[PDB]
RNA sequence: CGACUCUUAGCGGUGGAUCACUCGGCUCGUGCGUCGAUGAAGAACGCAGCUAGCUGCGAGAAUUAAUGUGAAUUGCAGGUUGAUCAUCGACACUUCGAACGCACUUGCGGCCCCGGGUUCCUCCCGGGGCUACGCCUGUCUGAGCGUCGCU
RNA sequence: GCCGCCGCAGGUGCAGAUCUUGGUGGUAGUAGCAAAUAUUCAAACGAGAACUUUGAAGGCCGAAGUGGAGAAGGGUUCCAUGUGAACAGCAGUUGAACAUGGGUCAGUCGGUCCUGAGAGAUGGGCGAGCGCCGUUCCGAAGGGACGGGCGAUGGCCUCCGUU
RNA sequence: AAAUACCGGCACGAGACCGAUAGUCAACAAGUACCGUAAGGGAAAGUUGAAAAGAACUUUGAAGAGAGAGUUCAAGAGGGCG
RNA sequence: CGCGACCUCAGAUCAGACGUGGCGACCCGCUGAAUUUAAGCAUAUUAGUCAGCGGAGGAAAAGAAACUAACCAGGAUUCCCU
């Protein structure tokens, strides 16, 4: 159970405080999961997907083993852009089609400067709590 | 009135600046709503009151 | 649109309902303290004759005996893959999995106020001091501690 | 005013002036019309400013 | 001839906008507004009418200096200071 | 060369207004092209020379406001807008001092007579 | 035979019940308990590249700084030395309104100091600062065949 | 998305109340588009002419006008470029509709500036109170001037505004 | 000072309640369209689909209206569309 | 006639500080109905309630007795049970 009475258990309010939401923590209910040999790497499993990020779909119609690549993250949306995943209009030109981020994962970080911070901080409280209980 | 207070003038300016229909890139957007506008005024039906 | 048209009355459209209902109705009730008290024992002997128990569904066919009780080493659990590794040793994890089954999407408005998945009732288990036993089942559906 | 306005017209183009008529739109906006000097030029000018 | 050939006798108005309600009924001839009393000190309102007052009260407008009172009220009605810099 | 406000604030004084006074003019000319004609690369480019200007107005003040609010620091009158300031209730209330005051009877009460610490036994 | 008249069925019209969904109401509870001459609540007019309404904002006008967040916004075009987004502590807020020079016609003034006609030289066109009632503490100028005083 | 068995709980069963709200018939392609004399022949624009546009005929208003210009009131209806859906009780090429784009310049023509019947502050007085009565009536209600004189400005304190 | 009161305000948490003729007048540009000289009076109005993939090309027509092509699991879901 | 002290009373854009107005759900001070009950109705009832006017606060107001008693005496004020 969720214990603490500042949280609330309550449908409606919780799709108001998801569907009237802003343009900042949207970066991540979008995030994804990273693949089985970046688990296995840096100590980090989910993350925030962003603009040059490598992928895979795994489900819909467009799923298997291409490692495509993002152009764009429509955050208004809830969903991202593919390379490759796309389809032909009635006037003969293509548009893109677009995939939320629990159906999809990651292949290729962008790997900045601010980017290398999130992934070195996530492998401290991982291995705090791992090792003040064990 | 042709002859008029610099007040009343300028009430009728704003609602000219008003009465006019929408621009429909209004509704080429994301989520919208709007089909159209029925505040629009014409002057031998509705009248302004003042 | 709204003129000449209805107003109050328990017929019109708006206009109030018959008889509008008010927080000061009688929401509660009382009993004697030697009925809340009469009431366990009964409640306790037919948890027992063990042809009650199974009237009220309980997976018990294989369970060692009787009224079961334990040595007391299980009041001081706080892991649950103990407490389960427990529930299977005595024969009675079969209740719980029927309680696995047991688990379904309501019917009614009851969905739209939040009281949407519902389940079946378990064992239950009787103690004299939680020194942790509540940390290891309380996440096992089905169980309720009780002191 | 007229008079503020006679030198704004004076201290920005450089050019000196005759009248400055004024009236007030239906919209709601001044517009001032600019006699402009005979040893001035105002296509000339005109052309300076961007309006042609 | 009371009826429809005496409302064209129609060229005059008896009332016009205040100007702090703004609200076209300030009796010329009397000069005091008919929904305020602007010439009067403080309003008019009234305990006889509800559906009258809360078409205007201070949740109605923008509340332009009232808004972010609540808002600075919570912390610790904070002035002068600034936060630490980079 | 966009004008980064960090980099503002320590120049002199006067040397802003010039380039006040050219943003008013890198800005005149995009409402006769906007009037005339077209021109995309003029139309929207008048968004970022209005918000150009209001980053020097506020520099301007902030320093100059400072200027005076540090020119009178220690002094016991003072204008209107550098005083203490919350709320109309809360600037009549009493000050510091007035709260503190205690009169000799009490001084002398509370002396003899303030309260102890002691344990009742079962 | 045929039209028409009535019944029933099939498929179509007309209409928007019923069912299923819900970012909305209703009721109970807890906690805090903050408007104003330093110009409120309320009004009015203004502000977008394309923009009328709800929104948000004030000639610094869908906002400027700063602290935090760390690569958008998006309906089309154009534009990492910190995009966009939350925080709000530094800066700023047209005209009315208890509303305050006099008056409600957006009309007539008085007092000083500044830049231009200047070479204060009044009148002239611009820019700034004061010009409401009531009342308390004290300061200045005074009135009284009120009560006394000394030449 | 839903239902049976044992128990709980209630804003729990419609033909009707000239009952509430929404929708649809017969009557019915029926009543009807009748007040103030009147039209016809040719052309040219067009996918469409009894009605619009030009030209010719015959007519009416008849200067107490179906003529020419204003004040209240309306608030852009003014003017050109288009459109043919809806509206303009047959029709539209037309329109005061719709859609886009223009249009109201003053010392000398008004308001301001003075009073009229009348509206109304302060002093006073009435009042539990917001407030009311009263307007010359129980008020120390004039903040200005040419000169006489003391001492201070400005431009050669010469001569005068300025205290 | 406390033990008391709190259908206005600022945040919060629940419900053996109501589910778009209900539930607040207000699920939506509502104290909004509109009426009254003025005090005041005051509505109606939720739903394509998983995604716009919102039907290129041809053909009758002056135009709306159509015939065939085509997207979708479906148009027996065609922009007021369960 | 002058000079000086007091008392009672003018005027200022004199130096510095205060009040007005708003919201009103709960609190304090006023003023104040008739429908309706009596099977009619005038006293009674509604009710010191509706509407009117005034002043506040985070609570207000009350408050350490010109107090209850009739006892083997309780000992400011508010609040619940009785």
Redesign the interface.
């Known amino acids: 159970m969720k214990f603490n009475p500042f949280v609330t258990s309550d449908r409606s309010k919780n799709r108001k405080r998801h569907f009237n939401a802003p343009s900042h923590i949207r970066r991540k209910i979008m995030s994804s999961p990273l693949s089985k040999e970046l688990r296995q790497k840096y100590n980090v499993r989910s993350m925030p997907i962003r603009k040059d990020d490598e992928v895979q779909v795994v489900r819909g119609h467009y799923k298997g083993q291409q490692i495509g690549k993002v152009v764009q993250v429509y955050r208004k949306k809830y969903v991202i852009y593919i390379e490759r995943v796309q389809r032909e209009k009635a006037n003969g030109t293509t548009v893109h089609v677009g995939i939320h981020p629990s159906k999809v994962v990651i292949t290729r970080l962008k790997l900045d400067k601010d980017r290398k911070k999130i992934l070195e901080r996530k492998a401290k409280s991982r291995q705090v709590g791992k090792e003040k209980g064990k | 009135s042709s002859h008029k207070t610099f007040r009343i003038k300028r009430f009728l300016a704003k609602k000219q600046k008003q009465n006019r229909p929408i621009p429909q890139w209004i509704w080429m957007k994301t989520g919208n709503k709007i089909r159209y506008n029925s505040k629009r005024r014409h002057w031998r039906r509705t009248k302004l009151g003042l | 649109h709204r003129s000449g048209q209805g107003a109050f009355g328990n017929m019109c459209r708006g206009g109030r309902m018959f008889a509008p209902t008010k927080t000061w109705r009688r929401w509660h009730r009382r009993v004697n303290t030697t009925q809340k008290r009469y009431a366990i024992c009964s409640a306790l002997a037919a948890s027992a004759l063990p042809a009650l128990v199974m009237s009220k569904g309980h997976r018990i066919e294989e369970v060692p005996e009787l009224p079961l009780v334990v040595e007391d080493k299980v009041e001081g659990y706080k892991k649950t893959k103990e407490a389960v590794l427990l529930l299977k040793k005595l024969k009675a994890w079969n209740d719980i999995k029927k309680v696995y089954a047991s688990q379904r999407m309501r019917a009614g408005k009851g969905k739209m106020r939040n009281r949407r998945r519902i389940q079946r009732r378990g064992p239950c288990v009787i103690y004299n001091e939680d020194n942790g036993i509540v940390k290891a089942f309380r996440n096992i559906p089905g169980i309720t501690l009780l002191n | 005013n007229k008079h503020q306005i006679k030198q704004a017209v004076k201290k920005l183009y450089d050019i000196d002036v005759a009248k400055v008529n004024t009236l007030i739109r239906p919209d709601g906006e001044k517009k001032a019309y600019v006699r402009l000097a005979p040893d001035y030029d105002a296509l000339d000018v005109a052309n300076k400013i961007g309006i042609i | 001839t009371k009826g429809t050939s005496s409302f064209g006798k129609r060229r005059n108005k008896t009332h016009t906008l205040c100007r702090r309600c703004g609200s076209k009924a300030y009796h010329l001839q009397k000069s005091t507004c008919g929904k305020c009393g602007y010439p009067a000190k403080r309003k008019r309102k009234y305990n006889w009418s509800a559906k009258a007052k809360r078409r205007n009260t201070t949740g109605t407008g923008r509340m332009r200096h009232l808004k972010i009172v609540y808002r600075r009220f919570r912390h610790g009605f904070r002035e002068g200071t600034t936060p630490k810099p980079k | 060369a966009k004008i980064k406000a960090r980099d503002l604030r320590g120049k002199k004084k006067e040397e802003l207004l010039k380039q006040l006074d050219d943003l008013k003019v890198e800005l005149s ?1 995009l409402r ?2 906007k009037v ?1 004609g077209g021109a995309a690369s003029k139309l929207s480019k008048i968004r970022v020379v209005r918000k150009s200007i209001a980053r020097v107005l506020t520099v301007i003040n902030q320093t100059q406001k400072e200027n005076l609010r540090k020119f009178y620091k220690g002094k016991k009158y003072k204008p209107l807008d550098l005083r ?4 109309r209730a ?1 600037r009549r209330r009493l000050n510091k001092h007035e709260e503190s005051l205690k009169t000799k009877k009490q001084q002398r009460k509370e002396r003899l007579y303030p309260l102890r610490k002691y344990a009742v036994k079962a």
């Open positions: 000319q006769v092209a005339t203490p300031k919350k709320t809360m």
